[PDB]
Amino acid sequence: QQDEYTSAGYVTCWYQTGLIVPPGAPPSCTILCFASACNDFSVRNLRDTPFIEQTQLLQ
Partner 1 sequence: RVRSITLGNSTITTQECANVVVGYGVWPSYLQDNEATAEDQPTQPDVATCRFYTLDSIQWQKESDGWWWKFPEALKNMGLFGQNMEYHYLGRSGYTIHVQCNASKFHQGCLLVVCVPEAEMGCSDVEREVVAASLSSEDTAKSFSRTESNGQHTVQTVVYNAGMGVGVGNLTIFPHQWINLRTNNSATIVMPYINSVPMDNMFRHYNFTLMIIPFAKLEYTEQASNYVPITVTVAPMCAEYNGLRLASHQ
Contacts of 27 (CB under 8 A, 6+ apart): 19, 21
Within 11-40, which residues bind its own copies (CB under 8 A)? 22-25
* 8: contact with its own copies by CB under 8 A: no
Q: In Å, how far from its chain's centre is CA 24?
A: 33
Nearer to partner 1, 20 or 57 (CB): 20
Partner in contact with 30, chosen from partner 1, its own copies, none, beta carbon below 5 to 8 Å by kind = partner 1
Contact residues toward partner 1 (CB under 8 A) are 15-30, 32, 34
Closest CA to 1 of 53, 52, 48, 55: 48
Site residues, its own copies (CB under 8 A): 22-25
